């Protein structure tokens, strides 16, 4: 049995309305009895039980033991260590795992939108770019929206560790040049810890 502790969604920690969770999952269970134990050590305080309820989403033969942990926004954003102590009737000893946010002083991202390259206009679908750089930690959230509606046709490159110790990434929206020609205004919305309201967006037009 190998244990994998996972962090909460970047959006989930930034907006007070969402519930950020910490996930403790396991793969490859030993053949014997499923006697498992969990000791969630939250850097001092301890919940122990939490909500370890493995909702066995059985498909074919797969089904793992997941253990989510409701996290208090600030506690995660302040560098608390969330440890998961997984055990089982088969493992020689209990395997522990610990997660926290990327330790370091936060830096506010700078967002710049870039219109389609004049060479791309020769094509039917021009692409709008959004440069988000100089931020830290990496945990960020970028979305695109036109007229107050999310645009699903866009991809975002993972954070690249720049020379300055900070991070940077690019989000590319793909829109029909017909729409771009109409002078529509698109917006690059970015959410990040060190931003004024954990939110900021930049528009593009013709």
């Amino acid at each position: 049995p190998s244990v994998f502790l996972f962090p909460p969604k970047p959006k989930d920690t930034l907006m007070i309305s969402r519930t950020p969770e910490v996930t403790c999952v396991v793969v490859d269970v030993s053949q014997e009895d499923p006697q498992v134990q969990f000791n969630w050590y939250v850097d001092g305080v301890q919940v122990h039980n939490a909500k370890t309820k493995p909702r066995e989403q059985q498909f074919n033969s797969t089904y793992r033991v997941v253990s989510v942990l409701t996290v208090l926004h600030q506690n995660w954003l302040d560098g608390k260590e969330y440890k998961c102590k997984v055990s089982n009737k088969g493992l020689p000893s209990s395997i522990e795992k610990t997660i926290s946010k990327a330790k370091g002083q936060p830096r506010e991202p700078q967002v710049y939108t870039l219109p389609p390259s004049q060479e791309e206009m020769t094509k039917n679908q021009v692409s709008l770019t959004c440069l988000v750089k100089g931020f830290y930690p990496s945990d960020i959230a970028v979305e695109w929206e036109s007229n107050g509606q999310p645009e699903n046709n866009y991809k975002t490159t993972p954070p690249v560790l720049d020379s300055d110790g900070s991070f940077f990434l690019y989000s590319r929206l793909t829109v029909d040049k017909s729409r771009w020609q109409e002078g529509n205004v698109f917006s690059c919305s970015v959410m990040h810890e060190a931003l004024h309201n954990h939110y900021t967006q930049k528009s593009l037009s013709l």
Partner: antibody
Amino acid sequence: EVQLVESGGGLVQPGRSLRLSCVTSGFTFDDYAMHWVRQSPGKGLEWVSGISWNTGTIIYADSVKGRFIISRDNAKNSLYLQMNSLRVEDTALYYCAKTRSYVVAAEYYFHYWGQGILVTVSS
Amino acid sequence: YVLTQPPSVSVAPGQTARITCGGNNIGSKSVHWYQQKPGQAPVLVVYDDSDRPPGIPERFSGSNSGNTATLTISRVEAGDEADYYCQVWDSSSDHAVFGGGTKLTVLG
């Protein structure tokens, strides 16, 4: 596209009551604190009340405290305003508003406004 | 809290209309601006001091520091004729205070 549609009532005799409603569309209601802002027929806007996403934090205007009762229903994407103990001074166009804040204590700004329903209080 | 903005402001087309929103230590708060056209619900033209919502024209600039917040409209046009309100959330008492409103009369 985001649209806030209000209903409520209209003309009413002082002392009587009215329950306003605001059904929202175009965004996740659960994520935003809704507010009611009225506009006195002829001069300026006046903030009336507001309620957090989880209903946890309810707040009212001093010139409304005790009378009006603001409510919300995430499951139904609806915002209400139980106007109890009406008064002629309350005659105004009531607007529904959507804020846009994620930080614990934000300086609210009304991102989206409804067309505004009218309540007339008189004998 | 108290906000104070001039009743009216008359500027001929082309000129820049600067609407002043007075406030005691308003620089510690983030002013917001709304545009209310006759018989139309107000619209957010500027928020958090200088930010503009998608679609609002570039000529709409926000300013705020010390005891004054100044909405500036470059190349004022007839379509910009309406009432402008400066709002601010008073953190000290949980109340949203709006200014009296200013009438941008594009001179004709």
